[PDB]
Amino acid sequence: WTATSGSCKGRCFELQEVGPPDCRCDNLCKSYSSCCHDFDELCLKTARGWECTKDRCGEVRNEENACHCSEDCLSRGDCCTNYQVVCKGESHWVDDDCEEIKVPECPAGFVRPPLIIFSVDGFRASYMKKGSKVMPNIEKLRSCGTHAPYMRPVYPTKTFPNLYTLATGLYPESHGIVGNSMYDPVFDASFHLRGREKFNHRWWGGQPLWITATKQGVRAGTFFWSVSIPHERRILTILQWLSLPDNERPSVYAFYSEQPDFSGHKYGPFGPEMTNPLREIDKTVGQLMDGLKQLRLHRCVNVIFVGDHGMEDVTCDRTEFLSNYLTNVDDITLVPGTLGRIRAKSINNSKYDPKTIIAALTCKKPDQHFKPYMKQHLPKRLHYANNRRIEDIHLLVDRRWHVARKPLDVYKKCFFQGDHGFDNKVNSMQTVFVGYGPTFKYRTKVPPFENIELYNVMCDLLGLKPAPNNGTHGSLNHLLRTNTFRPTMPDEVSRPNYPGIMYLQSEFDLGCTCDDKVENKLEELNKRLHTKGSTKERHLLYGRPAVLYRTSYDILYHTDFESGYSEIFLMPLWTSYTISKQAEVSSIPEHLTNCVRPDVRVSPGFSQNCLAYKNDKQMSYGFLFPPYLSSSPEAKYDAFLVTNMVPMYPAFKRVWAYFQRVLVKKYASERNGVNVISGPIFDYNYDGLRDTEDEIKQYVEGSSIPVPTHYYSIITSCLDFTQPADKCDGPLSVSSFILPHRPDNDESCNSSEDESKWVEELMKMHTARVRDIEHLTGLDFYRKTSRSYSEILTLKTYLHTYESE
Numbered sequence: 001w002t003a004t005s006g007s008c009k010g011r012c013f014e015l016q017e018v019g020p021p022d023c024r025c026d027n028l029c030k031s032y033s034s035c036c037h038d039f040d041e042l043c044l045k046t047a048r049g050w051e052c053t054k055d056r057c058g059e060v061r062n063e064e065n066a067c068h069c070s071e072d073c074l075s076r077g078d079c080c081t082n083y084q085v086v087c088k089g090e091s092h093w094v095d096d097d098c099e100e101i102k103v104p105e106c107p108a109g110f111v112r113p114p115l116i117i118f119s120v121d122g123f124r125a126s127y128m129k130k131g132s133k134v135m136p137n138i139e140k141l142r143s144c145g146t147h148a149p150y151m152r153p154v155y156p157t158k159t160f161p162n163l164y165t166l167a168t169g170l171y172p173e174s175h176g177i178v179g180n181s182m183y184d185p186v187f188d189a190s191f192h193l194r195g196r197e198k199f200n201h202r203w204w205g206g207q208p209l210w211i212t213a214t215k216q217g218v219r220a221g222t223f224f225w226s227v228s229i230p231h232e233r234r235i236l237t238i239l240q241w242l243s244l245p246d247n248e249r250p251s252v253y254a255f256y257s258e259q260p261d262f263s264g265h266k267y268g269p270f271g272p273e274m275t276n277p278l279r280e281i282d283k284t285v286g287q288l289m290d291g292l293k294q295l296r297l298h299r300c301v302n303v304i305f306v307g308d309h310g311m312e313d314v315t316c317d318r319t320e321f322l323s324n325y326l327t328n329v330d331d332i333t334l335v336p337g338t339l340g341r342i343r344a345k346s347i348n349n350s351k352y353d354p355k356t357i358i359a360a361l362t363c364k365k366p367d368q369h370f371k372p373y374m375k376q377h378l379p380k381r382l383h384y385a386n387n388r389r390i391e392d393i394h395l396l397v398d399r400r401w402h403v404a405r406k407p408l409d410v411y412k413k414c415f416f417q418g419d420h421g422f423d424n425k426v427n428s429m430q431t432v433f434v435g436y437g438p439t440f441k442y443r444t445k446v447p448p449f450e451n452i453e454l455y456n457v458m459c460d461l462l463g464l465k466p467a468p469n470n471g472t473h474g475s476l477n478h479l480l481r482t483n484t485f486r487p488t489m490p491d492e493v494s495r496p497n498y499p500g501i502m503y504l505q506s507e508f509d510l511g512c513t514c515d516d517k518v519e520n521k522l523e524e525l526n527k528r529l530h531t532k533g534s535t536k537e538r539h540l541l542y543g544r545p546a547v548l549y550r551t552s553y554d555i556l557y558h559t560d561f562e563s564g565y566s567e568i569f570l571m572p573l574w575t576s577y578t579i580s581k582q583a584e585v586s587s588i589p590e591h592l593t594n595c596v597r598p599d600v601r602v603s604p605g606f607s608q609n610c611l612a613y614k615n616d617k618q619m620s621y622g623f624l625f626p627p628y629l630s631s632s633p634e635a636k637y638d639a640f641l642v643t644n645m646v647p648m649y650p651a652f653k654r655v656w657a658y659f660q661r662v663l664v665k666k667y668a669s670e671r672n673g674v675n676v677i678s679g680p681i682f683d684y685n686y687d688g689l690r691d692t693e694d695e696i697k698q699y700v701e702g703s704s705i706p707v708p709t710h711y712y713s714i715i716t717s718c719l720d721f722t723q724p725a726d727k728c729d730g731p732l733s734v735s736s737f738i739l740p741h742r743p744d745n746d747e748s749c750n751s752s753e754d755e756s757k758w759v760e761e762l763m764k765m766h767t768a769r770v771r772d773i774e775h776l777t778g779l780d781f782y783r784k785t786s787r788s789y790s791e792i793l794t795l796k797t798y799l800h801t802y803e804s805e
């Protein structure tokens with residue numbers, strides 16, 4: 001119960017929010033329907049519209065008007081945004097040439113440039129080009145300020161997960177808003193776009209920019225807006241707050257637009273009906289900018305123009321129905337749409353088998369427009385697993401399609417032509433970024449980046465120290481004219497051992513055999529140089545990775561590859577090698593088919609053993625440096641060391657062997673050499689972070705040899721491909737992957753064909769950023785290059801998406 005009989009006189013859009021049962025006057029009261037009885041009258045004035053006309057100039061102030069054209073309005077801070085244009089012969093902001101803003105040009109009393117976030121729902125990246133003729137304000141911001149060709153949203157590419165990622169720097173799995181709708185099994189409650197449950201703070205984790213600001217003494221306007229407040233009133237409210245006294249005035253402001261998303265859903269991303277909502281958004285930008293120029297804040301404010309996701313063509317007839325796949329479709333609950341999440345209908349029911357559900361959904365129809373996954377098998381790049389609100393069963397739906405439970409859910413619940421929510425690498429889902437102001441660069445294009453990175457930059461723009469988040473601080477330093485953050489390399493925690501030859505062959509009892517006993521002082525010093533690091537400048541091009549946690553490990557040098565060998569996990573953490581464009585692929589000679597050799601540098605007690613693999617009827621093994629790429633028949637023996645061996649399912653060896661034998665050579669060929677770092681990843685609790693030894697749930701039968709959940713490779717070359725990878729003078733070019741280490745290839749519907757028809761497709765799906773691999777391994781890559789650290793941080797956040805342009 002609210003006693004809404006209090007008044008909003010003098011409290012319109014109050015910044016601090018008042019505790020019930022006292023009525024409210026802030027920009028959210030309408031959503032709680034707890035506004036004071038006079039809120040509409042006092043606070044939502046509309047009389048005479050939004051613009052001055054000749055006949056209003058100098059008028060006697062009428063307090064009933066939406067905004068004012070009277071003389072005193074500039075000092076009151078409540079002129080219509082075109083006042084100066086109509087009544088003082090000034091020009092619209094868009095009509096002014098852009099002049100570089102070398103320094104903040106702020107009125108007296110401004111302790112720092114204000115930040116205004118202008119966020120636009122459903123603003124697909126390609127609107128910047130395709131709608132350019134009808135968005136002159138936005139086009140000016142874009143070409144004058146700093147801009148990216150597109151910004152990658154987070155998955156799912158839905159509104160609430162994305163806006164709250166913008167505000168926190170956190171993956172949805174970490175901030176809690178893992179969908180537009182979601183069910184929490186602990187709360188036994190559902191969050192939806194519509195309704196009151198979303199107002200409860202228990203859903204919203206992390207620390208959003210406004211709490212970060214407030215905790216450090218910077219004042220923040222509200223980021224949420226009630227839908228009923230029109231856009232003209234939001235702009236005028238922001239401009240009013242900007243006229244407040246220094247000690248009361250916010251330093252950060254957010255404006256939110258429901259468009260073009262609202263129309264996009266109705267008309268598709270490029271419906272003829274889409275031109276007007278784009279005109280209208282642009283007009284609002286103009287209003288804000290004229291509003292700023294009026295207050296002489298237009299060369300003082302940093303403005304971020306940002307979308308939460310794009311929009312794709314989706315219609316009712318492109319819907320897959322689960323009722324066509326399962327007979328027991330009434331036992332499940334589906335979160336439907338552009339992604340699927342499936343859980344048991346009647347919770348705590350032991351008849352429900354996720355495994356049998358997945359199998360009924362796998363590769364059942366030749367043209368199937370979704371693929372089921374256990375959440376922990378989703379591509380690690382989606383970071384979509386580690387939250388109890390994410391159902392164990394996930395469906396990644398194809399672009400342009402929907403999934404629904406039964407036909408009655410679609411014809412009893414065609415409305416729409418547009419939707420979003422698909423995989424965040426999908427072109428139609430990319431969105432926009434423009435930064436404009438004193439702190440952003442002038443007429444600068446930056447590469448596409450992920451929206452998780454902005455929280456750190458916004459904190460910098462406000463002089464705040466950011467809460468711990470998923471951005472990589474420093475990786476967007478190149479957006480900024482002046483940087484408050486100077487990134488530095490994390491310190492190495494464990495230093496390696498460099499063992500020499502310490503063990504005699506006969507000390508090893510590993511059940512390993514090799515055909516290696518075939519009989520010169522010239523090639524004898526030469527082999528020994530290799531074991532001591534003579535070829536290391538060739539295979540470790542960017543210095544050795546740093547180990548960022550406490551462990552025990554050895555550097556092992558070889559003619560063709562160097563490795564970091566863990567005595568704890570009994571395998572390499574990383575193996576590094578370079579394959580020039582000239583290098584040749586050979587076979588494993590028949591006499592060496594099952595060859596595994598003890599490593600005399602590494603004690604029996606810290607080695608794997610062949611007996612374990614023999615006994616484990618599921619588990620086979622593979623090699624991190626591929627024997628296929630040995631530089632000489634003599635060097636090939638090194639590839640068969642027990643210290644280069646890793647546990648691999650036969651199903652997975654098909655993928656790995658094709659990567660090693662065919663793809664590495666092809667990339668070296670296409671990229672003019674490549675350097676490869678490969679290794680195991682252990683993430684049994686699917687939190688995206690390196691597991692400690694006591695977290696491993698699977699070992700090779702009868703052994704202490706832990707089974708990796710994934711295998712990664714980082715493939716680096718010279719961005720200028722006329723230079724070879726091993727002699728590169730400038731910026732680097734990278735692509736990486738994290739492949740799930742799975743006992744079957746059920747993920748790849750084509751896996752019964754030749755590897756050349758499915759393997760590369762799979763690896764593409766599991767493309768990753770170097771930074772993802774760093775969190776999963778506790779390693780730090782690229783410690784010794786000639787490049788600046790902030791450039792390396794950008795490189796480590798790069799994701800090769802394989803989309804077309």
Ligand SMILES: *[C@@H]1O[C@H](CO)[C@@H](O[C@@H]2O[C@H](CO)[C@@H](O[C@@H]3O[C@H](CO[C@H]4O[C@H](CO)[C@@H](O)[C@H](O[C@H]5O[C@H](CO)[C@@H](O)[C@H](O)[C@@H]5O[C@H]5O[C@H](CO)[C@@H](O)[C@H](O)[C@@H]5O)[C@@H]4O)[C@@H](O)[C@H](O[C@H]4O[C@H](CO)[C@@H](O)[C@H](O)[C@@H]4O[C@H]4O[C@H](CO)[C@@H](O)[C@H](O)[C@@H]4O)[C@@H]3O)[C@H](O)[C@H]2NC(C)=O)[C@H](O)[C@H]1NC(C)=O
Nearest residue numbers: 173174175176204205206386387388468469470687688775
């Ligand atoms: C992306 O960035 C984020 C942010 O940096 C990274 O997430 C962090 O990871 C840290 C390491 O895992 C994690 O630290 C843990 O915090 C525990 C305290 O948790 C609360 O306090 C913090 C601080 O204010 C708060 O942020 C948390 O908020 C979570 O939980 C609520 C709901 O309960 C949500 O509203 C909110 O969204 C958030 O949920 C997310 O995180 C939790 C895990 O914390 C997940 O379960 C959710 O699914 C969701 O993703 C919490 O309110 C702290 O107790 C932990 O400490 C244990 O372990 C260490 C090991 O060193 C040990 O020293 C401690 O003593 C302790 O062990 C004891 O407790 C164990 C567990 O109870 C117990 O089993 C043992 O036996 C011991 O008794 C730990 O420090 C940090 O909280 C999160 N932060 C966030 C915001 O998620 C994320 O990793 C990055 N992602 C990638 C891919 O890099």
Ligand SMILES: CC(=O)N1CCN(c2ccc3[nH]c(=O)n(CC(=O)NCc4ccc(Cl)c(Cl)c4)c(=O)c3c2)CC1
Nearest residue numbers: 028031160163164167198199204223224225226227256
């Ligand atoms: C965490 C926290 O403090 N609270 C307290 C306030 N609660 C709340 C209250 C009223 C609301 N009224 C309303 O219209 N909407 C729509 C709206 O504003 N959409 C734009 C928008 C902008 C910024 C962000 Cl970050 C997001 Cl996700 C969405 C809301 O979402 C909304 C949310 C949420 C939990």
Ligand SMILES: [Ca+2]
Nearest residue numbers: 121122159308
């Ligand atoms: Ca949206």
Ligand SMILES: [Ca+2]
Nearest residue numbers: 683689690691
């Ligand atoms: Ca883990």
Ligand SMILES: [Cl-]
Nearest residue numbers: 158179180181
């Ligand atoms: Cl959702």
Ligand code: NA
Nearest residue numbers: 613616619620
């Ligand atoms: Na075996």
Ligand code: NA
Nearest residue numbers: 745746748751
């Ligand atoms: Na298959």
Ligand SMILES: [Zn+2]
Nearest residue numbers: 122159261265
């Ligand atoms: Zn939408």
